[PDB]
Amino acid sequence: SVLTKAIVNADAEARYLSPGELDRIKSFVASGERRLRIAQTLTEARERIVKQAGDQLFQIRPDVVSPGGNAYGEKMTALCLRDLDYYLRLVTYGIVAGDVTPIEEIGIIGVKEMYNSLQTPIPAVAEGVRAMKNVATSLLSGDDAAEAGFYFDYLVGAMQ
Amino acid sequence: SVLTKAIVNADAEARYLSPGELDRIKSFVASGERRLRIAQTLTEARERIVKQAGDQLFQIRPDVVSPGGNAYGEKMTALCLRDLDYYLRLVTYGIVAGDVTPIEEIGIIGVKEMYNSLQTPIPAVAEGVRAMKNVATSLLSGDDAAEAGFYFDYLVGAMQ
Amino acid sequence: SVLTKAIVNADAEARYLSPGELDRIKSFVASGERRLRIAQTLTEARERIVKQAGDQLFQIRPDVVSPGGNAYGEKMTALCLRDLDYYLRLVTYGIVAGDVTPIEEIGIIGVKEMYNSLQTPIPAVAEGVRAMKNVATSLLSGDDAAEAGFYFDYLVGAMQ
Amino acid sequence: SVLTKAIVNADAEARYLSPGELDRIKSFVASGERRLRIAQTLTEARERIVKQAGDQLFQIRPDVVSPGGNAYGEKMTALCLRDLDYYLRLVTYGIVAGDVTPIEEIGIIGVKEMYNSLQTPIPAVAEGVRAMKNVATSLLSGDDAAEAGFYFDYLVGAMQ
Amino acid sequence: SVLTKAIVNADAEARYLSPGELDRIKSFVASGERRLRIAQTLTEARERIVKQAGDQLFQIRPDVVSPGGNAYGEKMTALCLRDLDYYLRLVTYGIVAGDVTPIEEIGIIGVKEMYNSLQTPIPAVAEGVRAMKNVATSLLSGDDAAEAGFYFDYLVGAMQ
Amino acid sequence: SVLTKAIVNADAEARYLSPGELDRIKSFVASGERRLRIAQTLTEARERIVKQAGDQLFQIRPDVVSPGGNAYGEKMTALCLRDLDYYLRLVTYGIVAGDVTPIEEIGIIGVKEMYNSLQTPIPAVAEGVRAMKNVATSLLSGDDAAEAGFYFDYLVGAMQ
Amino acid sequence: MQDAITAVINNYDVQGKYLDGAALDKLKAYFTTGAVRVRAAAVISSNATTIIKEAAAKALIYSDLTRPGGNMYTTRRYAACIRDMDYFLRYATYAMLAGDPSILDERVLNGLKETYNSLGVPIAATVGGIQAMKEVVGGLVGPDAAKEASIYFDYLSSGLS
Amino acid sequence: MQDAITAVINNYDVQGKYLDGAALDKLKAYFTTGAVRVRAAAVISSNATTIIKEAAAKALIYSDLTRPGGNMYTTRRYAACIRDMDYFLRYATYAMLAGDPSILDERVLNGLKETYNSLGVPIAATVGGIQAMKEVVGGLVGPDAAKEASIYFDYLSSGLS
Amino acid sequence: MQDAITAVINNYDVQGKYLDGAALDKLKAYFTTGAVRVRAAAVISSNATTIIKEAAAKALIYSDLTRPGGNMYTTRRYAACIRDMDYFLRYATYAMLAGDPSILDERVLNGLKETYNSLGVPIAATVGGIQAMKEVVGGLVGPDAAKEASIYFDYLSSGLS
Amino acid sequence: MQDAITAVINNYDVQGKYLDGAALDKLKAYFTTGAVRVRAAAVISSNATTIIKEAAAKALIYSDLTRPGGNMYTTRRYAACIRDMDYFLRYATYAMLAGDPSILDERVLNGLKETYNSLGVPIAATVGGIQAMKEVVGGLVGPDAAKEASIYFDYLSSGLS
Amino acid sequence: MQDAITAVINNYDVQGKYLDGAALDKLKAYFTTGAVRVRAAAVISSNATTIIKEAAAKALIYSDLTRPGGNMYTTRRYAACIRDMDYFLRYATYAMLAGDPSILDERVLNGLKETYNSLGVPIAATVGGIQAMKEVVGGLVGPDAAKEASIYFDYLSSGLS
Amino acid sequence: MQDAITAVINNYDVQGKYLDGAALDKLKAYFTTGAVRVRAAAVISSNATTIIKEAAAKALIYSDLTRPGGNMYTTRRYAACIRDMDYFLRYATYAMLAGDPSILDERVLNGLKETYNSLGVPIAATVGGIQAMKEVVGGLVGPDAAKEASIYFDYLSSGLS
Numbered sequence A, B, C, D, E, F: 001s002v003l004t005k006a007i008v009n010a011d012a013e014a015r016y017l018s019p020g021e022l023d024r025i026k027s028f029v030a031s032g033e034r035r036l037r038i039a040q041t042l043t044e045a046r047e048r049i050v051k052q053a054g055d056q057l058f059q060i061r062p063d064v065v066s067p068g069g070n071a072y073g074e075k076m077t078a079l080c081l082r083d084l085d086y087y088l089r090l091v092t093y094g095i096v097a098g099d100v101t102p103i104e105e106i107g108i109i110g111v112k113e114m115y116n117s118l119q120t121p122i123p124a125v126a127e128g129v130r131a132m133k134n135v136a137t138s139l140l141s142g143d144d145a146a147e148a149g150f151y152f153d154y155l156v157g158a159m160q
Numbered sequence G, H, I, J, K, L: 001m002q003d004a005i006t007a008v009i010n011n012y013d014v015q016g017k018y019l020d021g022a023a024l025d026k027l028k029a030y031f032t033t034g035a036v037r038v039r040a041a042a043v044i045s046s047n048a049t050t051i052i053k054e055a056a057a058k059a060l061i062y063s064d065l066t067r068p069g070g071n072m073y074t075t076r077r078y079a080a081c082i083r084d085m086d087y088f089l090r091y092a093t094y095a096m097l098a099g100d101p102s103i104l105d106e107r108v109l110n111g112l113k114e115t116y117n118s119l120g121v122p123i124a125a126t127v128g129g130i131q132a133m134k135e136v137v138g139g140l141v142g143p144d145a146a147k148e149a150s151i152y153f154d155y156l157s158s159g160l161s
């Protein structure tokens, strides 16, 4: 979280938290209810976000759903949207934690090696995530949509 | 600053800033004008804060202004308030930076060794700082007084 | 070479070459003329090997020469065969050196990062190399074809 | 062996064997029957090689079999030839292994310290080994005599 | 001791004692009876040394036995002389050992942290030790008084 | 010296000299005139000590002055006594320094490698040194003879 | 380590569940106490040294513990003991900020009981040193934070006994 | 390193001055552009790889540089070059967030000119690689941030020439 | 470690025996299969990644193992698992070249059973991952080498169970 | 470690006692034997190599121990064994100078019995190697020092058995 | 490093000369002043902190040096400066014990002039800090030792200028 | 480093040329001398110590160099000098096996001239030590190899002068 990150840096330098570290915990916790609302809205529309993300993805990259494509077929496509459902879930976790610790251990560290083995084209997974940003972001107020958007762009960043 | 701290951690792990790190820069910068107002008020009353801090200090610890005291005499007392003026200045710097980097390099790292040499009683310097908190805090709104108070308690903490 | 590899291990342990190390230099150098003949034959048929490798490749993986394929188009295909010409050249170098030192520094260390940037599908480059093995190997005697084949399978291995 | 040496280097760099490493295993194993014949011939003449080595040694260095000599006397000479029998044995091991791993752990690492304690003149042990080379080499074909000779010169080298 | 110090340096360099190290053990042990006499005299006058040290101390630094002083009061003074009794004891140990190993582990390593916690003024403890030197030294012959004096000045040195 | 050794340990632990270290400097310097007398006596009889050492040596080990001996011949014997003159000189240096620093850098570190190259039997050099102890020691009072003897036995020790 | 918030995230992640109403209620229960945790940490940090001093004075020194034969005899061991005290105080402050005791297990309690048995360090005496620092802390931090700080000192002390 | 804010603090600290009106105006001029800097960094970070790819394509590859005899010939050196490119992009993003170029001097430019002379690395070609990434960046980040991102790419490139 | 040849040398060395007829026959039995071992290693090495992919597909993924609550859930653990798989494949290739399983004990099996018990790693599932890679390997290497490769995969798998 | 003198100091320190008559008598009993300890150490040090050689010759070599199947077979292990011997001799010389066996426990015996069981090193044979070096030492050092050197060799050998 | 005694030994060693009358006279001239050097070192060591304090008070602080813009402004730099002072005092005490300045060259002066130029450290001000510590030292150590201590402070200070 | 064969490969790689007739002729000229290089290395290695001994005896010792004031005076420096000699011999043996002097530049000559100037090591005397080892080597290795070994000793010696 913001808490975990602050503390780990504190303990590693053998010290109490800084004024800065204390301030960010305070600003973070003040945004608690708002962050929880952002996760709720997106949890509430998960099936729509995934499905519409999946259409947006296959238009932009029809090659993955083609003869020599990693997601070619009905059940190679079913698993592909399931992976898109996984990442949206992790994005809701990140938003309520206020950093990526959880998102990272669960779904980016090791992701290159996993997908290389499965021979999944990584950059088109990054596209599927942009597609989810676009949908999710259209169900949130301007301010909340930006706050959510940072976590989408992080995942897009880590698959790189 | 908050910027320096975030970046140094970024560069040291060979990476772009986290969603968390980006968020705190955003919350921090939003508090810019407020933090600048807190520094202005205190800069504007510096002579009062120091002087009234100095009275509050010598009542609570009359021994430092006594025969065998580090601050005994008119010019051993003059230097003592000057040191109190130094630390109030550093506290205004810290508040506008949103962390202690500047406060630390300028006036706590090496402070034990400096004052031990001069034979200054460190814990009564910590008291002089509490005394300044009390005065400064009475010239600020509740919310701004707390935000200022964290930086006073840090200095009090570091002299320990 | 075999020489470089033997020596580097010798110098690093601060010692003269072992009986083993001396033996392999002797067996290696005895195969000199043969290894030179293997490189000559393949150098002499380079244009055929590349072209027929390129046909064998695009049948087996038509997706790379398709709308969303890295090698789609006449000049995206021209560069692709040029890369196949590069690797055949490095394979002739390796065969005459009796190890991969040269092959490695020139065309595998950094190859993941290069091709990831260009977004070239690495495993289909490995296929292009298998295709070259098949052609080159049909222009060599059984014994020489095996000796050549080890170096083809190495490159195939390193792109992995 | 050649196998052990190749593998240890492979595992230590976290990788499969190189074309070079594979080639030397192949050339080595092809010489298997020949190497086994070289060991057999020498095993078959061990008593002659040792005895004639021992005469050649004491002519060239009569001082070791003299009043203040390490090998002075009938049973100080008996142990000396037994040590010569030990090293011929290790030389047969080395020849069939195609390197020194076994020869080294059994009879050179620690040999300075052992013989210094016993006060045995090391360089005259090296001479006893040259003497064995001369005898053993006269019972082998030109090609096999050279292959054997490398391992004799190694031991001579390590006692140095 | 002198023994412990010599040996630890010997063992750490994996070696027998030097001529130098052997010489100092010899000179040291020759002074055994004398060193034992120096400890006896001081052990025999411990109560006088402490008490007269305590008067000499409070004249020179009356501030420690004053309202805001660490040793202010009858039982804050009782503990203060007890600490002076502790250090005289350690000084007798050091003199019979011929170095500080024992003095150091028992009463200087950690002493800054201990007294800082208790808020005891360290440099006035150093004065209490000088005061003991003055008394103890007046009960010893010139030669023995110097030998004792080195250990008093060490403690004075370590509280610094 | 004793000085160099004490100081190097002081500086390496970032500290002033210990009571122990100070004591040994004092005991050492008190023995100055005596140590200088011990060196003078031995310097004054150097030619006798060497020559009589050389006779004592060749009786005890006639093999070094025999056909296959390192010191066989008139000028192989001349260099041998010159080496005995070298070591007596270093022994006088050590005695006046009160430790081996000088003796060590000048004539033991590297001595194994030097003499192994020249093929000089090291343990018979150690005997030549014992022989010098016997002669030198017969020209010194009991107390001074022991003090000298430690440095002779050191050299004997280091050639081992 | 984990805090309140990551405790919930990992409990749901292993079930692969999006956060539901029960989860969201737990996280609120943390956020709603957050500002108070911060203020309490700033009091503890800035009074660190005084808390140790008053806790030692009530529960450790003026005793057989500090006398010859006692485990906090020698400046060496006295220093080690109040060094330890600072660890406890500092980590309890982390646990209370995080609203989760998991850090006290991972980085403080694991193996510590046996470490103390092996050195001879008196366990019961150390617990009193913990419960004295709690007493001081609860005065300094006030009604707002007293109960919340207190529990992680109690976590520490039943972790040793 | 220093940022906008610490640049001002250290400039006043050496004079021992409390922050005055001129100082306070400078800091405002930074804070007032802060939110825009953050958004721009998130675009650059998340498009990092594409920016390098498009910058190399316009300014480096399809050339003698990538051919035998060229400095970015061999997979080894091609990898080293786009590795470098990532450094530049990443640090320029730091400089732009900080609103101060000092980090580009301390951790990137110092000794780099001579390092490149010593290895043979073509300086002019590297500058074009920098000014191509700037071109791409300025499109992606938009009106808000274009000028501010751009300057630290220009700082980098006149630091080499 | 030891191979076929050093296994024999050390067995005779402890008896101080020159190699006799029985020894020489054993070594021949190794040398005579040597060329085939090399060819088999070159197939395995160059198909390494495909063998893991096909072995995981038949024996690990599309299952509860890869789902929340499963040990190869999370990209972290999926990566660790196929990392392990590569170790097994690679070392079995060493054992088969050496014609001796001793390396599989020294550098792979020692402590591994308990390491897996301590982390919770499912042993039976890992064995199936080993015996699936064997199945693939035996197809790729052909009649010549199938039995010889196979045994060191079987050595690995009865080493865990 | 501790010597005669620090053994006494620490025994009194834990009671917080100034040194009394009984203590002073013990220390005298050490100082009065001190010069003799030094002379004995100089004999041992300067004959180190010869003592090991004569001790090995009487108690280790010319035996099954040095033959194939024996633990001091191979130049490697022969070297390790006489290396060990040098440790024993050297440390016993330290113990005898210090007039305290504590160093033999701290730096030599602790875990050594099991280390030897784990490698297969023959304990009884090692004791004979210790008691043979004692025999040689007792001749070389003379009446003055014989009993005092001897005890720390006996300490070593009942520490293994 | 070298002291009085090793200065002579090495001067003769390079000529391969046994020590002669002139050498022996030099060494006597050292030994005869030795006891006084020791007493002086014990005074300096035990007054170390007070010497620095009085030297700083006469020659450094209450000045522009300690004010903003000054090199010993900031607790960091004030600490570094009196840290340096302690080095000088401590090493001069070594040089004076050794009766040789060679250690002041090897471990203190070498490169220090340029190090100070590179950081901006004021050389003239540092010399005054050295010559003030000398002044204090010469009072504390007395007639016996005053001239001998003094020279190595003077060695230090003409080493910088 | 590079050898004969990689010298050719890298010379063609920078031109991106497949090996042509001229290249193939060069490589043959190396392979055809290869067996002789190996035999020569085995003679040098196994006579290493004797070559140094005979080279020192003809060109270094029995001289002012080994006397007080000389650079190979002291067992320390005598050891360092013949240590160096072993480097030269050993590396020249590498260069001759490789059929390329590049290793003598990369790992032996680079900076060595100035290193010797800085320590005072006599260059001309070291060259004679090199050319004496060459003389011995050329006798031991015979007609086959004499000229080929010799050149890398000559490379070494004109590298210093």
Ligand SMILES: *[C@H](C)[C@H]1/C(=C/c2[nH]c(/C=C3N=C(/C=C4\NC(=O)C(CC)=C4C)C(C)=C\3CCC(=O)O)c(CCC(=O)O)c2C)NC(=O)[C@@H]1C
Residues within 6 Å of the ligand: E064, E069, E070, E071, E072, E076, E077, E079, E080, E081, E083, E084, E086, E087, E106, E107, E118, E120, E121, E122, E124, E125, E128, G060, G061, G062, G063, G066, G067, G072, G073, G074, G075, G078
């Ligand atoms: C007198 C010269 C100075 C002084 C002393 C003073 N000391 C205390 C309290 C304690 N002192 C110690 C000291 C030691 N413990 C050790 O193990 C050793 C090594 C042998 C030493 C030197 C300890 C442990 C205490 C705590 C009490 C206890 O024994 O449990 C006090 C009282 C302080 C308080 O807050 O109670 C005083 C006054 N006071 C001065 O001002 C002089 C400078």
Ligand SMILES: *[C@H](C)[C@H]1/C(=C/c2[nH]c(/C=C3N=C(/C=C4\NC(=O)C(CC)=C4C)C(C)=C\3CCC(=O)O)c(CCC(=O)O)c2C)NC(=O)[C@@H]1C
Residues within 6 Å of the ligand: C064, C069, C070, C071, C072, C076, C077, C079, C080, C081, C083, C084, C086, C087, C106, C107, C118, C120, C121, C122, C124, C125, C128, H060, H061, H062, H063, H066, H067, H072, H073, H074, H075, H078
């Ligand atoms: C064909 C089997 C595959 C394929 C290839 C392809 N390559 C490129 C572009 C480049 N390839 C390289 C390769 C190398 N440079 C080296 O130095 C070495 C070592 C000798 C190699 C192998 C380089 C440098 C480029 C950039 C162009 C240039 O030379 O400057 C392309 C074009 C990609 C683009 O975006 O322009 C293609 C298509 N394509 C496939 O799909 C096959 C898998």
